[PDB]
Structure formats: structure tokens, C-alpha cells
Design brief:
Distance between the termini of chain A: 13 Å
Structural class of chain A: alpha+beta
Number of domains of chain A: 1
Keywords (chains A, B): Lyase, Signal
CATH topology of chain A: Alpha-Beta Plaits
Oligomer: homodimer
Protein name (chains A, B): Hydroxynitrile lyase
Organism (chains A, B): Passiflora edulis
Largest interface: A-B, 35 and 34 residues
Subunit structure (chains A, B): Homodimer.
CATH class of chain A: Alpha Beta
GO molecular function (chains A, B): lyase activity
Shape of chain A: globular
Largest sheet of chain A: 4 strands, antiparallel
Chain lengths: ~100, ~100
């Protein structure tokens, strides 16, 4: 089947407390708890210039897996996802998102 | 174990033939046959604005996993990686790379 990866890179607005950033990340992960569509959620922070210096100011990555584009769009337009979007996107100084069929 | 994800987004320069691009991608994947540290290599093309319009001109994603930062670094500074980087990066119109330790 055509399994889809959804990968987000972002940078947070500077005025936000790390406490609130932590909350926003927790809120994102918790979307999996009642959404069967969103699978394999993981995230982390870029390891910095001693590892590699091509992050271009993005600080955080988040990955999730959907078993179809249909599942992704049902999730994306679900009430919990729409409510989370109101806190996530305004918190981003910048963002880039790719959605792709996983080839190996 | 602190598992490292290496996520690359790019866009290729417009003057390259699709044959040339296909070769670069095949070469990248075939680094798994050379570098024992590189695990779970996958790639794909962004699905475009009908699915989500946040790719900011990036067209391709590549993912791989390393079992430690030390393993990533040994790979990154290995002669085959240094060689491939000299083929890959100059072919990019756009490039962003994040390396992160997995959180769930």
C-alpha cells in the first residue's frame, strides 16, 4: 500500500516560553491518542553545528505516518487537528512540511 | 540508545535531466551497501498543494537512521560520504537537513 510520511520542520516564535513550547509539542503528540490515523509520531531538536550545519534556522523536526492520503486528510480536517492548528501555526516563526509516499 | 534521524529536504537544479536526478537518488540509497552505519534509508517526492501547501519549493525528502551520534559522525566523515556530498549538494537548488535524537 501507499503509506505516506508527513514531516514537519519548524522554528518557534522567540517570545514563547519554553514551557509553552513543551506544551505545544505535547499537544501535537497527544493527537495520536484518539486519532487512529496518525501513527509512528516522533520528534526532536536539531543536534546543532557540531553534528551538521545545514538546518538553516529550523530547530525542531516532527514525523508521522499515515496509511493513506485519505487517512491524512480525514485527520487534517478532524476537529482536534483543526483546534491544534490554531495553536501550532501561529507559534511558528517558520515552517516547512513535506508529505510523501515512502520509497525504499 | 539515542537513535539519530537524518532528514533531508531538497529541490534539484532545473538544468539536470531526470536521468541525472534518478542517478543521484540511486547513488544516495546505495550508500547503505557501503556504510554499515546507515539504516532504514527511504525517500519520496512531495505530494504537492492538493494535499498540503507548506513545502516552500522543496520537492524531495530523504530519511535515514543511525544508532548513535558517534555512528552518524563516522559515516558523515567517511570517504564515500565526503565523495557523495560533492555530487549531491551542488545539484541542489534548495537544501535543508536536520539531525535529531528521537523522542516519542
Amino acid at each position: 500500500p501507499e503509506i505516506v510520511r508527513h514531516i514537519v520542520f519548524n522554528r518557534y516564535k522567540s517570545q514563547l516560553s519554553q514551557k509553552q513550547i513543551d506544551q505545544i509539542i505535547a499537544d501535537y503528540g497527544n493527537l495520536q491518542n484518539i486519532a487512529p490515523e496518525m501513527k509512528e509520531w516522533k520528534w526532536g531538536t536539531d543536534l546543532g553545528p557540531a553534528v551538521e550545519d545545514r538546518a538553516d534556522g529550523f530547530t525542531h523536526a516532527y514525523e508521522s505516518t499515515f496509511h493513506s492520503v485519505a487517512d491524512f486528510l480525514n485527520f487534517f480536517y478532524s476537529p482536534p487537528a483543526l483546534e491544534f492548528a490554531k495553536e501550532f501555526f501561529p507559534a511558528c516563526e517558520k515552517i516547512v512540511v513535506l508529505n510523501y509516499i515512502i520509497n525504499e
